[PDB]
Design an enzyme around this catalytic site. Structure first.
Site, PDB file in Angstrom:
ATOM      1  N   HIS A 138       0.882  -1.186   0.000  1.00 15.89           N
ATOM      2  CA  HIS A 138       0.000   0.000   0.000  1.00 15.89           C
ATOM      3  C   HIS A 138       0.916   1.231   0.000  1.00 15.89           C
ATOM      4  CE1 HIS A 138      -3.466  -2.367   2.038  1.00 15.89           C
ATOM      5  NE2 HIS A 138      -3.326  -2.712   0.666  1.00 15.89           N
ATOM      6  N   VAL A 192      -9.072  -3.491  21.241  1.00  7.64           N
ATOM      7  CA  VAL A 192      -7.912  -3.818  20.419  1.00  7.64           C
ATOM      8  C   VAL A 192      -7.422  -5.206  20.820  1.00  7.64           C
ATOM      9  CG1 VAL A 192      -5.561  -3.178  19.782  1.00  7.64           C
ATOM     10  CG2 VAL A 192      -7.288  -1.403  20.146  1.00  7.64           C
TER      11      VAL A 192
HETATM   12 MG    MG Z   1      -2.701  -3.519  -3.452  1.00 10.35          MG
END
Ligand code: MG
Ligand code: ADP
Ligand code: MG
EC number: 2.3.3.8
Lengths: 425, 324
Positions: free
Chosen positions: B274, B300
């Site tokens: 990403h 969490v």
């Molecule tokens: Mg990707």
């Protein structure tokens, strides 16, 4: 993604393309030096190395080189050579990164006062680009700052009014003009970060002593005319490998997404996970279970690559893990989420074709393979994995949607057993 | 930030691009959701002239119009308020900017990965001023069970059946990752009454709509009783959730895990898939953000390993108090 460029690359681009009233000094006056440098040939190409004293420093994305004693200042060429003697080619730890010092810049020494060292920086955010200035530049940099909106233009009066309040009065117009030229160059070449610390101004003009920068690598199709054969170096502490360049070259050839970065080429833990996010999770999981010192790679394949594309990706990973036997053997994690549109049958067919051609070595290096994958045609994909694991002798364990995504990691590391009641499910 | 409801079982969309398979996957989803009509009113493809395409509504063959000029599609199908953009990265900026000239479009999905961040910043500014919700870039999209799914999100029918994505439960999620969004479909369906709505914001540095943008919509959606967030290393977005809770804006239970904890154990930087995965300051690490979330009242887990376990725990405590 935004990628860092070397100080030299950034300086070359600035010198070539910046438009400013200010005469910028010592343009292109640098010498790159490596352990292989032919010093006689270097003096042929750069006779100015004998005309004045020099500054030498590594250009390898190492920060605060001064604090680390890695900038030799005001040295004759002989002094540069002596200074380089205990540093060039030597292994060095900076922070927690360990690497080889092997790429240095030699530039002319520019005399100047501390009052003539300035700080300039431009970096990008969601709401625009922030322009910073501080009149107290140098290694010991509270700084003036202003946001330039997304479609806003940097009007030189804000430079003069806000940024240069603390700048000496005489140097304000040349500083205003340079910062204005710097910002336009920042935009045109798609920089996302650009720091000049220190920027020096004497009575003879502007000097770019230091430069750190990142550019938006995605904008190559827009910028390649000016970028040229531009290079993005790895962070200090890593080598660049041809396999990485091979995979990056494939990713450039289709909408598919093929990333690969080598961490520990001798590590016994290899992954070939699908997805940008899943590949991170598996990495998080492996390290959470104490395997950070044996994880060999980070990489992902996604975006529905072809069967050939997947074979080319997989055959790269398999070669890398068959270059030296490990005492305890090795492990290969072929994982991923339930894919949305990637053909799991076509991609695993390509991987299976790679495991066949490399089956011999994979048994020499005692590789064990673990598989978990869902998505379009995942059942047929799971079958050929289990079937190649039998037509080779390589031990493969194949899991499906009825297995937690990262469970096969614990299996692979001996933190949980292998459940044969979940095969092909 | 902008609208609260983006999609419904009556949402009609235009598809920019020759993505026949993705449109058919949407139609199969519309069918087993018992939608009255297809969600894709028309396709746009500037390469060929106006025509119509064979598609399958159940077993019955139907036709969807394919227009060369976006002006002709918007005019002949004024019922459309959503556009799913499959344009290549080189043309995604232009086509998206062209879309936002039609005030009928309130939500745009940008699939393409590789759009320069400076360009996406310009897209954000136009949508911000026009109230358009952008989902993307670099996303598969998202899915609203029973109502609407963006392109390839959710996969084929067999996955839509296995994860009970043909009717909504009470759990909304938002993720950066497209592939993991379908894993969240699987995990949530196995531990709760199922997904109510899911959005993948994409992996880019500046997503068209942020985590908090959709978390806020979920706080304002009554059918949503709990929220899951698959956060990520990079940026400071998830800190808005800590703030939202602190200010009394976020009251429903929120489960969050940020991926990228391994990067804290690497000796130097590693860029993940990403584009926005880079942690530029210490506060942008996955470990730093997970810790801040737990201290703000977010549920969490210790690791992704145990994410489904905490989701089930929050769900049952919600069923206990008769919230679901
Ligand atoms: Mg990707
Ligand atoms: N060419 C040069 N001429 C004169 N002084 C220099 C030159 N290059 C660097 N210096 C001095 O050395 C310091 C450290 O160099 P610099 O390139 O900024 O590296 P780093 O910021 O990594 O320490 C500078 O702040 C400046 O005072
Ligand atoms: Mg410096």
């Amino acid at each position: 993604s935004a990628k860092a460029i070397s100080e030299q690359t950034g300086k070359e681009l600035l010198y070539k393309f910046i438009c400013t009233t200010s005469a910028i000094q010592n343009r292109f006056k640098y010498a790159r030096v490596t352990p292989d440098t032919d010093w006689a040939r270097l003096l042929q190409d750069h006779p100015w190395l004998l005309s004045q004293n020099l500054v030498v420093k590594p250009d390898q994305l190492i920060k605060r080189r001064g604090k680390l004693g890695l900038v030799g200042v005001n040295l004759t060429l002989d002094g540069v050579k002596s200074w380089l003697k205990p540093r060039l080619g030597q292994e060095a730890t900076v922070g927690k990164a360990t690497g080889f010092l092997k790429n240095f810049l030699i530039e002319p020494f520019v005399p100047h006062s501390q009052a003539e060292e300035f700080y300039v920086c431009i970096y990008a955010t969601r709401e625009g680009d922030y322009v910073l200035f501080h009149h107290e530049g140098g290694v010991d940099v509270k700084a003036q700052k202003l946001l330039v909106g997304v479609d806003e233009k940097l009007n030189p009066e804000d430079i003069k009014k806000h940024l240069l309040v603390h700048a000496p009065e005489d140097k304000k117009e040349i500083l205003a003009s340079f910062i204005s030229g710097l910002f336009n160059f920042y935009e045109d070449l798609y920089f996302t970060y650009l720091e000049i610390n220190p920027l020096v101004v004497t009575k003879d003009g502007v000097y770019v002593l230091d430069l750190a920068a990142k550019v938006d690598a995605t904008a190559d199709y827009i910028c390649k005319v000016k970028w040229g054969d531009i290079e993005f170096p790895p962070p200090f502490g890593r080598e660049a490998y041809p396999e990485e360049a091979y995979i990056a070259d494939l990713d450039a050839k289709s909408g598919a997404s093929l990333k690969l970065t080598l961490l520990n080429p001798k590590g016994r833990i290899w992954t070939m996970v699908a997805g940008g996010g899943a590949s991170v999770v598996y990495s998080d999981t492996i390290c959470d279970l104490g395997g950070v010192n044996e994880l060999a790679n980070y990489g992902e394949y996604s975006g529905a690559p072809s069967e050939q594309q997947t074979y080319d990706y997989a055959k790269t990973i398999l070669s890398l893990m068959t270059r030296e036997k490990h005492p305890d053997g090795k492990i290969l994690i072929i994982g991923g989420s339930i894919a949305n549109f990637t053909n799991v049958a076509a991609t695993f067919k390509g991987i299976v074709r790679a495991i066949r051609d490399y089956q011999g070595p994979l048994k020499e290096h005692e590789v064990t393979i673990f598989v978990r994958r869902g998505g379009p045609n995942y059942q047929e994909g799971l079958r050929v994995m289990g079937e190649v694991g039998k037509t080779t002798g390589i031990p493969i364990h194949v899991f499906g949607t009825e297995t937690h995504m990262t469970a096969i990691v614990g299996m692979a590391l001996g933190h949980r057993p292998i459940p044969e009641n979940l095969y092909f499910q | 930030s902008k609208s609260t409801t983006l999609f419904s079982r009556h949402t009609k969309a235009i598809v920019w691009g020759m993505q026949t398979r993705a449109v058919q996957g949407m139609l199969d989803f519309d069918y087993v959701c018992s939608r009255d009509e297809p969600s894709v009113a028309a396709m746009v493809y500037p390469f060929t002239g106006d025509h119509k395409q064979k598609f399958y509504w159940g077993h019955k063959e139907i036709l969807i119009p394919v227009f060369k000029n976006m002006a002709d599609a918007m005019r002949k199908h004024p019922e459309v308020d959503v556009l799913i953009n499959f344009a290549s990265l080189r043309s995604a900026y232009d086509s998206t900017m062209e879309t936002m000239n039609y005030a009928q479009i309130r939500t745009i999905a940008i699939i393409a990965e590789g759009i320069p961040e400076a360009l996406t910043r310009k897209l954000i500014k136009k949508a911000d001023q026009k109230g358009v919700t952008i989902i993307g870039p670099a996303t598969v999209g998202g899915i609203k069970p029973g109502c609407f799914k963006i392109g390839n999100t959710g996969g084929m029918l067999d996955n839509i059946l296995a994860s009970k994505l043909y009717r909504p439960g009470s759990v909304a999620y938002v993720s950066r990752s497209g592939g993991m969004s379908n894993e969240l479909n699987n995990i949530i369906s196995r531990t709760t009454d199922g997904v109510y709505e899911g959005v993948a914001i994409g992996g880019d540095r500046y997503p068209g709509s942020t985590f908090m943008d959709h978390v806020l919509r979920y706080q304002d959606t009554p059918g949503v009783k709990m929220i899951v967030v698959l956060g990520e290393i990079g940026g400071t977005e998830e800190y808005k959730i800590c703030r939202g809770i602190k200010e009394g804006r976020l009251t429903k239970p929120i489960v969050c895990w940020c991926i990228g904890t391994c990067a804290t154990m690497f000796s130097s930087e590693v860029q993940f898939g990403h584009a926005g995965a880079c942690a530029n300051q210490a506060s942008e690490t996955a470990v730093a953000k997970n810790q801040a979330l737990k201290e703000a009242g977010v549920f969490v887990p210790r690791s992704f390993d145990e994410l489904g376990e905490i989701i089930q725990s929050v769900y049952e405590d919600l069923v206990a108090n008769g919230v679901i």
